[PDB]
Amino acid sequence: MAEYKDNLLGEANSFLEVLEQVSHLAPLDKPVLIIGERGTGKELIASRLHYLSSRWQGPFISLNCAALNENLLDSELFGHEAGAFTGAQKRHPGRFERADGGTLFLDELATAPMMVQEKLLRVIEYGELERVGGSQPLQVNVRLVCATNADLPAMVNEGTFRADLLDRLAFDVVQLPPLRERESDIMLMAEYFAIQMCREIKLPLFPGFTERARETLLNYRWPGNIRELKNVVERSVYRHGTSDYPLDDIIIDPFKRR
DNA sequence: CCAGGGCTGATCGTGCAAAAGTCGTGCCAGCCGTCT
Numbered sequence A: 001m002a003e004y005k006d007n008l009l010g011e012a013n014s015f016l017e018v019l020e021q022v023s024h025l026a027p028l029d030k031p032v033l034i035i036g037e038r039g040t041g042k043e044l045i046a047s048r049l050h051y052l053s054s055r056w057q058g059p060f061i062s063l064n065c066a067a068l069n070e071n072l073l074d075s076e077l078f079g080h081e082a083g084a085f086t087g088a089q090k091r092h093p094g095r096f097e098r099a100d101g102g103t104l105f106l107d108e109l110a111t112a113p114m115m116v117q118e119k120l121l122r123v124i125e126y127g128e129l130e131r132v133g134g135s136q137p138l139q140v141n142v143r144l145v146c147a148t149n150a151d152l153p154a155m156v157n158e159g160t161f162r163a164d165l166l167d168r169l170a171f172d173v174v175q176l177p178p179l180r181e182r183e184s185d186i187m188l189m190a191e192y193f194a195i196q197m198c199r200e201i202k203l204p205l206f207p208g209f210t211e212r213a214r215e216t217l218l219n220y221r222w223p224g225n226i227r228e229l230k231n232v233v234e235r236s237v238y239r240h241g242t243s244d245y246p247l248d249d250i251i252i253d254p255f256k257r258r
Numbered sequence B: 001c002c003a004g005g006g007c008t009g010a011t012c013g014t015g016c017a018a019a020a021g022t023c024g025t026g027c028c029a030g031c032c033g034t035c036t
């Protein structure tokens, strides 16, 4: 029941809500999903579901479902008790076996390949996985949480991603709102970042913010968000490179040439 | 004076696979027994 807390940083009255919705499902062991756009602050949330569960005792391995080897998929996922180096006592590890009693994080689910998608399937609800070799398969108790920024329904129409896997996985999908829509925690997010930032670049103390600064930073549709705010602020700050006069200028894109 | 961290050394490991070798049986050439 212990709470990690970390950096909730939400003053949205909709991030509050976001925290509230996930909290109810934290105890739950059902498959879940997390959906975010290019700038959504979702990695913390996957941890905030498992951080808040009874099985908070469990290990929280989270694989990157996009980078696995096509060829080693069978081995990587399951693993083979015989290990290596002959009569060696060292046993093979495994993917799904190394997450019993703890939440498993799957990322880039939409991007995950057809071989991976078919391979998932059949292990999601059955609970039995058999390592290459042998005649015995052992049930694992593993909690599926999936984070994706891509739109699943469109993928289903295309046929690129199997429809059944998506349907079976996550009864409830958490909704994350874009930053242009928070619109409120920027005064707060922006300072927090900048405050960190001052010690990473080794300044003492923030100068302060011009009103204009805040006219620009409110006023913009912020394409691929949050992370975006950090970048707009972190650069702009190191840019300025001092602590006499307050911060006066922020650049949205360091592309434009001048 | 007692507990925590580092580091060295002590310990466990008789097989998998690649190429050379043998195996059995067939194909064909050359000698020899016998009838016409």
Ligand SMILES: Nc1ncnc2c1ncn2[C@@H]1O[C@H](COP(=O)(O)OP(=O)(O)O)[C@@H](O)[C@H]1O
Residues within 6 Å of the ligand: A007, A008, A009, A010, A036, A037, A038, A039, A040, A041, A042, A043, A044, A149, A226, A227, A230
């Ligand atoms: N509520 C928050 N509190 C603190 N930091 C946040 C929050 N939301 C976003 N961030 C910052 O923005 C980044 C979000 O990246 P991430 O969630 O990994 O993107 P994605 O979910 O698209 O992979 C993090 O590195 C984090 O520092």
